[PDB]
Amino acid sequence: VGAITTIEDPVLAKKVPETFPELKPGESRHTSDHMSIYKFMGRSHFLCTFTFNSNNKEYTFPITLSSTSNPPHGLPSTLRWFFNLFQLYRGPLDLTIIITGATDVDGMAWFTPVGLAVDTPWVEKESALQIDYKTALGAVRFNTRRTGNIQIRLPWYSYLYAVSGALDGLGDKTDSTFGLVSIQIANYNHSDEYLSFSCYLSVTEQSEFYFPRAPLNSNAMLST
């Protein structure tokens, strides 16, 4: 009987459809499930990459959930796909960056909340900020010889209830930015050996997601 329904009436839309005779399809054989969001996005995913061409230059990139900004500057691949399925987001993120190439390089990375005075996004230039201004916001000082990779949790500091990935114009310039991560290099002296970085973003267990949207039409998804 369940093979006929009126979908123009939403009350009958929650009916359990039946068509032919069936059996219960047993169980799933592997223990964990892969459809829980906190697992699928539990895996880390790609974010961005940049290289330094000279000593004592500082680099800065925002983490922008906007759909409008197209890669190489923006969210590529999966993240661009994942943050557009749902309307809102809040809660911390787990950031992992990976160092390659040259060695014996000191560096100090900090995190800057949205709106505060900070270097221009996606621009590689000498730092304009007072050294006293940097360490106040908090920072980690890392050397490339010993580790070469850093896994650190970005906090949630914002004056917004939450951040959104689908916006247009005047709103998209403000609400859609999560925060800025910056990396300064020092003692790069030889310009050879090609020091390069890469970032990887992950989602925590304290993150939330709200109000499912529609997925992106194929011409939207891109790659670097």
Partner: protein, 246 residues
């Protein structure tokens, strides 16, 4: 006296991006390592932990016409059965309309379950006619066209009537395959024997002709929805599934 010793094992200092437990952050910028409480307030009580929220919502796969000039036994439209199937398109802006069930599985290698098609007619009350939805288990590379109408009633099918107050037919393909899991071949380039995507093809015949008086249109368009139940997945990846056309 101090005695504590530990042998440093192999695989020293290797970043594992595999699963979450190896992606979790060791340190934090958060002042005094503070924690965030949940805040349901502005969200409307709607929290999403599970992709079932998308895949349990019907979406528009395809739209095929039904014409009065089509004699009995003629195949109107042939569909493969996979979540990957959407033929829709748009003009302004240029884009490829994707279903929801597709965009969830386009990120995954394997799946199993039951794809539930929902056929929605848009007739008047004054048209009359029937259709036959014939499920043909198999793979998608078989030749489906040489099938007549009489031969089709063997396979499972359901006969629908166009007139009435029920415009919608829910048709649930039972999962039938030799292997417990199908696979996503569209990433890989060419065909291979034994490696399949669909569980078989769907057919829609014209069971009776389409009759109608003069002052109404003679052809009834029918949308085709798509959605799943008991859907399982694993082995994520990134892929852009192109529109399957004909």
């Amino acid at each position: 006296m101090m005695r504590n010793e530990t042998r440093v094992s192999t695989t020293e200092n290797v970043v594992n991006l595999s699963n979450y437990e190896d992606a979790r952050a060791k340190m934090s910028f958060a002042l005094d390592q503070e924690d965030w409480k949940s805040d349901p307030s502005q969200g409307g009580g709607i929290k999403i932990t599970h992709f079932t929220t998308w895949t349990s919502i019907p979406t528009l796969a395809a739209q095929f016409p039904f014409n009065a000039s089509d004699s009995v036994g003629q195949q109107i439209k042939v569909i493969p059965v996979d979540p990957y199937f959407f033929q829709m398109t748009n003009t302004n802006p240029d884009q490829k309309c994707i279903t929801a069930l597709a965009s969830i599985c386009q990120m995954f290698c394997f799946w199993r379950g039951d794809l539930v098609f929902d056929f929605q007619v848009f007739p008047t009350k004054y048209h009359s006619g029937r259709l036959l939805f014939c499920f043909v288990p198999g793979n998608e590379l078989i030749d489906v066209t040489g099938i007549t109408l009489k031969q089709a009633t063997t396979a499972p099918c359901a006969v629908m009537d166009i007139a009435g107050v029920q415009s919608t037919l829910r048709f649930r393909v039972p999962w039938i395959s030799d292997t417990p899991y199908r696979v996503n071949r569209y990433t890989k380039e060419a065909h291979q024997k034994g490696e399949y995507t669909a569980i078989g093809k769907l057919i829609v015949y014209c069971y009776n002709r389409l009759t109608s008086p003069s002052n109404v249109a003679h052809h009834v368009r029918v949308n085709v929805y798509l959605s799943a139940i008991n859907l399982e997945c694993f082995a994520p990846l990134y892929h852009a599934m192109d529109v399957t056309t004909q």
